[PDB]
Every structure is written in C-alpha cells, then in structure tokens.
Nucleic acid binder design. Structure first.
Ligand SMILES: [Ca+2]
Ligand SMILES: [Zn+2]
Ligand SMILES: [Zn+2]
Length: 54
DNA sequence: GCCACCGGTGGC
DNA sequence: GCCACCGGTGGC
C-alpha cells in the first residue's frame, strides 16, 4: 500500500507478470531492451497508477 | 498537458 | 551490487 498501490484491486493482488503486454515485452526477462521500466499492465493499480499505465 | 523514455534508489 | 518500479521531463 504505497502512492501507486491501493493494495486491494485485482491488479494490486497479482504478483506474476503476464509476459505479453507492452511493459512485460520491454523487460529483459521477456527479451526486451528495458527502456520503459514499468510493471506489467495487469499489475497496474486500478485506483492509483498513472492513468496511461492502466 | 501527455507519455515514452530515462535516472535513481529502497530493499534486499 | 542488483533489480523492480517509481517520479521527472524533453519533446511533442
Ligand atoms: Ca541502495
Ligand atoms: Zn504484462
Ligand atoms: Zn490497487
């Protein structure tokens, strides 16, 4: 429960990255160049994340 | 004013 | 020293 996490929504309760969204595809562990550096789209808090991350 | 980056660090 | 993931912003 931080500035960007309500700790209660479905996104906040996911711990696993989907591996198929733009943010995951950017990640090194999914073969990306690690230039965007955000959490999986599915883990973006529904209440508190920047709107364009949702 | 928005958002794709990019710089930075809390918490290991 | 690393890595997840945040906040600031150049360029639009
Ligand atoms: Ca540190
Ligand atoms: Zn994802
Ligand atoms: Zn949430």
């Amino acid at each position: 429960r931080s500035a960007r996490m309500c700790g209660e929504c479905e996104a906040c309760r996911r711990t696993e990255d989907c591996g198929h969204c733009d943010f995951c595809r950017d990640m090194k562990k999914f073969g990306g160049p690690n230039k965007i550096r955000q959490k999986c789209r599915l883990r973006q808090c529904q209440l508190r994340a920047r709107e364009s991350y949702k």
